[PDB]
Design a protein around this ligand. Structure first.
Ligand SMILES: Nc1ncnc2c1ncn2[C@@H]1O[C@H](COP(=O)(O)OP(=O)(O)O)[C@@H](O)[C@H]1O
Ligand SMILES: Nc1ncnc2c1ncn2[C@@H]1O[C@H](COP(=O)(O)OP(=O)(O)O)[C@@H](O)[C@H]1O
Ligand SMILES: [Mg+2]
Ligand SMILES: [Mg+2]
Lengths: 362, 354
């Protein structure tokens, strides 16, 4: 373990709210602040997850895939710590920092499929997240950590780079006025298109919306629309496969019903299908990485749709749950915080209590 | 007391609803006597050892001291029968009388325990509070379990159901029944009440009615408590409306599960607050009212879980709430879920950023 890794792993991550992120990109003078923060914060986050990695089973860690991820994380941490001797007022340092985040971003581009392959390899020993709770626990933390460093670095790139400026209507990747229903309809369409290619039909969308906060007004919150789209797209692909296969011998498809509700503290989206449901017994299994009732290949089969969409929801203190009526259909529900100031990053920390994690006759 | 130490050494023996049918059919009295004279003391002694791990100031409240003396007396009454032959007809008859007496003695256990929790909280922090929730879940599940056993023996052996089990429980009729009980209370208190809109799907046997083996009084209690909740939420959220949205209920029978979902437009609950809804005593009402005591949710969930079902709430804050009951569809799979006092329960009395 390089000394810089050991050092930075002793700090805990510092979580930001979406309110704070919006304020960073509020103006140009914040670049030196974002620089001074991220040059310390990114090494802390990388070092915390690196020390976790070393806790994994030897046969996992020594996969070429996990040895690659670790070598990338370590190089990225060094690249960043190189900036510690620079003045935040040094305009050349700030320019070089942006270029460095672009290089780290590119270097980390295939981290998720790379880890997912380490898992596959390791799954040799037969061991699995569906049957191994430690592996599940690690993958939630590794992937939430990744979501968090990507979000922070992208914010700085998309606000301060010359060449990569993101949507002019967003602050970094955040839409301070996210048209939630619009993102629902777009994700539904994406899913429809994939579904039609596997089955030559897909259900229709029946959408309802309720603005409890101000009745009859359009529903908007501060949100990252790509995260929202990914959760919706994964739940739509799931509802559509379940619907089509359950109903295959009927004259037509029951639509998927979606309701979007804005309340004082929460934005909630419920997606209801008549896809035959799931026995209560296997509901928890459904959120394990790799768990799929489909053959492994894509519409389905890798088993990442649920646990990853749930990490997106939980990342800013939201949640994702599924409640099924076996024999009939399923409700999938996303909860997001409606106030940017309560939308706070949910981060893993490598400490005694994490290390430890690694009466009813029921 | 000595009997308590001894019997606390055994772990409870859970029964499935299939075994209770099988052993409640013929008129089994000698066998049920032999079993219950051992099993009842084991379950009493188990929860008695657990009461003793509680804060000293809770254990000493007059209410918990009452519960403890009742449980100990019942264990003693029951242990006396270990000197009798299961072929002694006086004994068999005296055992029925003894169970009736234990049931009467325990009749006020829940309010008395609930009162103990008050004397304690008025007399004296959230970690303990979490421990109190874990304890009350186990204490009340243990009572549900002993009351279930004692009552089967009483109803079958004393002087269509098999005891309290209906082998053909008409789920939809029990729904309608509990709805009506709730509606009457709602009308009396609020002057109006929502209608029931009920749908059913038999996935297991399309077009056929939905029956499973179940304890209708348990199912009734759960539904009643959830309807009282849905009705109050609806009426209070729509207080400036000329009418009331119905409560929508769907009953579904699938391969493994019977599911019942109750949907209201009672304005729902912030997600922040969902878990605390299942806290004993948590209520947004004051204090016939429909609400105020705060036991509806946690108790209904113990009934659901006792035979390995479950009960969850999911809400769309600003709009309404779904409450959902799951029951096992197979009598062989409806097996009692029982607390046991072992080192692992004793052990039961940060990794992600705050
Ligand atoms: N709406 C749904 N209805 C029925 N089953 C579902 C639903 N959503 C997910 N599942 C079950 O959960 C599994 C896991 O979903 P997911 O994690 O998206 O992986 P994948 O779709 O790749 O199988 C699915 O294979 C399916 O068995
Ligand atoms: N369907 C519902 N909609 C809105 N709030 C609910 C609903 N069900 C329960 N609650 C909330 O949960 C609290 C606890 O419910 P319960 O345990 O039944 O106690 P009580 O009804 O005595 O308050 C209620 O007071 C209410 O605030
Ligand atoms: Mg999927
Ligand atoms: Mg209630």
């Amino acid at each position: 373990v390089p000394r810089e890794v050991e050092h930075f792993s002793r700090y805990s991550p510092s979580p930001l709210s979406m309110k704070q992120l919006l304020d960073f990109g509020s103006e140009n003078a914040c670049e030196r602040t974002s620089f001074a923060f991220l040059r310390q914060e990114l090494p802390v986050r990388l070092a915390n997850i690196l020390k976790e990695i070393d806790i994994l089973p030897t046969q996992l860690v020594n996969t070429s895939s996990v040895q690659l991820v670790k070598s990338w994380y370590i190089q990225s941490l060094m690249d960043l710590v190189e900036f510690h001797e620079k003045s935040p007022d040094d305009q050349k340092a700030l320019s070089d920092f942006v270029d460095t985040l672009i290089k780290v971003r590119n270097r980390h581009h295939n981290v998720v499929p790379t880890m997912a392959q380490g898992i596959i390899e390791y799954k040799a020993c037969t061991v699995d997240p569906v049957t191994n709770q430690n592996l599940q626990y690690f993958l939630d933390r590794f992937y939430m950590n990744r979501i968090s460093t990507r979000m922070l670095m992208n914010q700085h790139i998309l606000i301060f780079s010359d060449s990569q400026t993101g949507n002019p209507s967003h602050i970094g990747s955040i839409d301070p006025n996210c048209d939630v229903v619009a993102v629902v309809q777009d994700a539904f369409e994406c899913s429809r298109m994939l579904c039609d290619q596997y089955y030559l039909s897909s259900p229709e969308l029946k959408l309802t919306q309720v603005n409890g906060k101000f009745p009859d007004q359009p529903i908007h919150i501060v949100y990252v629309p790509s995260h929202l789209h990914h959760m919706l797209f994964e739940l739509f692909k799931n509802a559509m496969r379940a619907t089509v296969e359950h109903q295959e011998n009927q004259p037509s498809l029951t639509p998927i019903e979606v309701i979007v509700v804005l309340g004082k503290e929460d934005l909630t989206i419920k997606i209801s299908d008549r896809g035959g449901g799931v026995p209560l017994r296997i509901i928890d299994r459904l959120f394990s990485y790799t768990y799929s009732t489909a053959p492994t290949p894509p519409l389905a089969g890798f088993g990442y749709g649920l646990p990853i969409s749930r990490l997106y929801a939980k990342y800013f203190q939201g949640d994702l749950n599924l409640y099924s009526l076996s024999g009939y259909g399923t409700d999938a529900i996303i909860y997001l915080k409606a106030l940017s100031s309560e939308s706070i990053e949910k981060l893993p920390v490598f400490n005694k209590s994490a290390f430890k994690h690694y009466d009813w006759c029921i």
